[PDB]
């Protein structure tokens, strides 16, 4: 039910992962119709809740969530929030946007993912690779991704991140 959307979102504020994960699943099943309220009822004062909003938007994958996800990935301080957004950025359904935003949007996602792939925290860089791999379905974007991935395989301190790069290169 569509009337329940705000309540479902409000559940993320009660820090019970079991309950939140149920509310999120519910939102995702509702899909596109919940996206507007998910975008405008983000809890900016509870990172635990915010991470669920972002995760839910990422799973729905409506490309109208691009700018929220970019903000979250680029300027949020909470790692759980940023990682959720990084994954999401590579997997939105770009063709749902009116031409030519269906081309521009994935390119903006890429720019952000390239930017956060320099972060000092390994888990942000890991999530950034996962986002980048998601952009393989888009021909114009493959050169900078390949390129970035090679530079990271060369420079990365972390064996975990190098490994994930290798998995992405396949």
């Amino acid at each position: 039910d569509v009337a329940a959307i705000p309540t479902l979102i409000a559940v993320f504020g009660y820090n019970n992962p079991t309950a939140a994960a149920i509310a999120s699943t519910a939102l995702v099943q509702l899909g596109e119709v919940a996206v507007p309220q998910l975008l405008t009822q983000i809890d900016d004062y509870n990172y635990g809740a915010r991470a669920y909003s972002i995760r839910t938007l990422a799973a729905i994958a409506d490309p109208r969530a691009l700018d929220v996800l970019i903000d979250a990935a680029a300027t949020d301080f909470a790692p759980s929030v940023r990682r959720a957004a990084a994954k999401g950025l590579g997997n939105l359904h770009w063709h749902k946007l009116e031409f030519p935003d269906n081309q521009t949007a994935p390119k903006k996602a890429l720019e952000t993912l390239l930017f956060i792939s320099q972060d000092a925290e390994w888990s942000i860089r890991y999530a950034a690779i996962v986002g980048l791999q998601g952009l393989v379905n888009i021909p114009d974007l493959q050169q900078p991704i390949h390129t970035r991935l090679k530079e990271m395989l060369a420079s990365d301190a972390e064996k975990a991140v190098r490994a994930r790069i290798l998995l992405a290169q396949s």
Binding site: A10, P36, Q41, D67
Partner: protein, 266 residues
């Protein structure tokens, strides 16, 4: 290898000078980040202000539906810096085609409190409530009514009262709250403060937070115990009480009453 709730870094390590320079980087993400950073760290140096003003005319960075990401972040940053040199550029942003620039500008004009924005704010209320609709598929109304109404209250635009008053019956709850705030600021009638008190009692947390901030901004004394008992985080309660305290300013018994409530939320 360890978990941090609040990390040492969220991004390139910047200084004011470096953030300011990065506004003109070929890396658009870095410009975007730097504009956020300058607002977050409240870097009020004049050269930060001038650089952000220039970024209000950015054309390099565009997104979905012809959005202007750097203009949005620059606009938001300028409001936190307290420098009214920004007012004319922010005023111009009120006619930007990107909704989110208009919104950011109106929020910053509300923070700067400069009455020279009134005509441009008034124009965004053209058509009144009847025209204050939502276009299909957009997650926003046609104009940032919430911020515009709040801004008109904050700048003391009393001529706008008859344009504002109808928004108390807007279908969107956030818009009605903003119209209550503005109406109180511009008329000082308790009935409008009471509507904010009633939002505090409501089922909606985000709305309670907004009502707290509004009650603080207007300094409505009678709401003190309702603020202290509201279902919201102490941080918002303290900001609301602080605004009440500032209106009641040595020491009246009303100020003490408010301080005693503030003491209990620590």
């Amino acid at each position: 290898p360890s978990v941090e709730e609040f990390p040492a870094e969220n991004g390139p390590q910047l200084t004011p000078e470096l953030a300011i320079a990065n506004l003109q980087s070929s890396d658009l993400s870095l410009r975007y980040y730097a504009a956020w950073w300058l607002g977050k760290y409240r870097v009020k140096e004049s050269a930060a202000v001038d650089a952000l003003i220039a970024a209000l005319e950015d054309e390099a960075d565009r997104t979905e539906l012809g959005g202007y990401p750097l203009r949005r972040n620059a606009a938001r940053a300028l409001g936190k810096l307290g420098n009214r040199k920004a007012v004319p550029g922010l005023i111009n942003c009120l006619e930007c085609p990107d909704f989110y620039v208009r919104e950011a500008a109106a929020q910053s004009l509300e923070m700067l409190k400069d009455k020279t924005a009134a005509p441009a704010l008034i124009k965004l209320l053209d058509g009144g409530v009847a025209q204050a609709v939502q276009v299909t598929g957009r997650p926003h109304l046609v104009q940032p009514y919430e911020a515009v109404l709040e801004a008109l209250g904050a700048i003391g635009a009393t001529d706008a009262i008859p344009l504002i008053q109808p928004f108390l019956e807007h279908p969107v709850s956030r818009v009605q709250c903003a119209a209550a705030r503005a109406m109180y600021q511009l008329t000082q009638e308790p009935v409008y403060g009471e509507l904010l008190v009633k939002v505090l009692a409501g089922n909606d947390l985000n709305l309670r937070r907004v009502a707290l901030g509004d009650l603080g901004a207007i300094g409505y004394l009678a709401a003190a115990e309702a603020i202290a008992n509201a279902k919201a985080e102490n941080s918002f309660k303290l900001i609301a009480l602080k605004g009440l305290l500032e209106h009641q300013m040595s020491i009246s018994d009303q100020a003490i009453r408010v301080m005693n409530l503030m003491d209990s939320l620590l």
